[PDB]
C-alpha cells in the first residue's frame, strides 16, 4: 500500500535527474529482480567549499516509509560520521526531517540534502545526537575542527 509514496518518488527521481546541485548524488537502489527500489536511495553529499568538510564526499542512505510523504525520510550516514547532530547509528537530525516539526510535503530531496550539507559545518549545538562530537566541539573547538578535517580527507573521492 505504498502506491502514493511510489508515485511521488518516481517524480522526485525524474526531477533530481533533470536538475540537482553539482557533486551531489541521489539514486534509488535496486531490487534483486533488477527493478528500482524507490523506497531506498543511496546518496552522497559533498563537503562545502571553504569549510573543514571540503573535499569529502559523505555517503548516506535515504529510507522512505510506506506513508511517505506524510512522514519524512530517514537519513543515515554510512558509515556514521563524527558530527554533533549525527547519532552513532548514522541517523542525521534536522527540523525538516521531523514529522512533528518542520517536515511538510513542500520539502524536496534537494532541500534535504542541501539542508544536511549546511548542517555539516553549522551544527545545532543545542540539540546534539551524540555525546562524543558535542563534547569535543564545546571543549576544544580547534581539536574538533582537526577531527573534522581528518574525516573529510578520509572520505575524499
Amino acid at each position: 500500500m505504498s502506491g502514493i509514496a511510489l508515485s511521488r518518488l518516481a517524480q522526485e527521481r525524474k526531477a533530481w535527474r533533470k536538475d540537482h546541485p553539482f557533486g551531489f548524488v541521489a539514486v534509488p537502489t535496486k531490487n534483486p529482480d533488477g527493478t528500482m527500489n524507490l523506497m531506498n536511495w543511496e546518496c552522497a553529499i559533498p563537503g562545502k567549499k571553504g569549510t573543514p568538510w571540503e573535499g569529502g564526499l559523505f555517503k548516506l542512505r535515504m529510507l522512505f516509509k510506506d506513508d511517505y510523504p506524510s512522514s519524512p525520510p530517514k537519513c543515515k550516514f554510512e558509515p556514521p560520521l563524527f558530527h554533533p547532530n549525527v547519532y552513532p547509528s548514522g541517523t542525521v537530525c534536522l527540523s525538516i526531517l521531523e514529522e512533528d516539526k518542520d517536515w511538510r510535503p513542500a520539502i524536496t530531496i534537494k532541500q534535504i540534502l542541501l539542508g544536511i550539507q549546511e548542517l555539516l559545518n553549522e551544527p545545532n549545538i543545542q540539540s546534539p545526537a551524540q555525546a562524543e562530537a558535542y563534547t569535543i566541539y564545546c571543549q576544544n573547538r580547534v581539536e574538533y575542527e582537526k577531527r573534522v578535517r581528518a574525516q573529510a580527507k578520509k572520505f575524499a573521492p
Binding site: 546534539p128 555525546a131 558535542y134
Partner: protein
C-alpha cells in the same frame, strides 16, 4: 528479608537496607552486566533511593560501586554505550527510541558524584559527563545542589 528483583521493581531506601549487609554484592551479582541498558537501569533504580543519611548513603554508594566495578572491568563492556544510555535515561541527551526519563535526578547525580571518584571509573568518560551535566536542562536546574556538587567533583577528575 528482601530480594533484588523486588527491590528493582519498587525501589525504596528501606528495601535496599532489607537486602542485607551484602546488598552491594547482590545487586551486582543479580544484574546482567553484559547489557549496558540493564546496567543503566540498575544504576538508576539503586540511585533513586539515595538519601543524605548515613546508612542509606553507604548502601547506595556500595551498590553503585559493586555494580559499576563489575560492569566496567569487563573488557567487552562498552563504557561509551553505558554513558550514552545513562544520559538518555536521565533526559539529558535525545535518542531515536522512546524512553521514560526519570523525574528526579537528585539520587542519580549524588550516585555519579561518588562513582567518578572510584578507581574503576574510566576517566575518559568524565569530559562527556561534564558536558551534559553543565548543558542547560530544567531537570538539572531543579537539583542545583547535587548538580553543582557533581560538577565540582568532575573538575577534579
Amino acid at each position: 528479608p528482601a530480594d533484588v528483583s523486588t527491590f528493582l521493581a519498587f525501589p525504596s531506601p528501606e528495601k535496599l537496607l532489607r537486602l542485607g549487609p551484602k546488598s552491594s554484592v547482590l545487586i551486582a551479582q543479580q544484574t546482567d552486566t553484559s547489557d549496558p541498558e540493564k546496567v543503566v537501569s540498575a544504576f538508576l533504580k539503586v540511585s533513586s533511593v539515595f538519601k543524605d543519611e548515613a546508612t542509606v548513603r553507604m548502601a547506595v554508594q556500595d551498590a553503585v560501586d559493586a555494580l559499576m566495578q563489575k560492569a566496567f572491568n569487563s573488557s567487552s563492556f562498552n563504557s561509551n554505550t553505558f554513558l550514552t544510555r545513562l544520559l538518555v535515561h536521565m533526559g539529558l541527551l535525545k535518542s531515536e527510541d522512546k524512553v521514560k526519563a526519570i523525574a528526579n535526578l537528585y539520587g542519580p547525580l549524588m550516585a555519579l558524584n561518588h562513582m567518578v571518584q572510584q578507581d574503576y571509573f574510566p576517566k575518559a568518560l568524565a569530559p562527556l559527563l561534564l558536558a551534559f551535566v553543565t548543558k542547560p536542562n530544567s531537570a538539572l536546574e531543579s537539583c542545583s545542589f547535587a548538580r553543582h556538587s557533581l560538577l565540582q567533583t568532575l573538575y577534579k577528575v
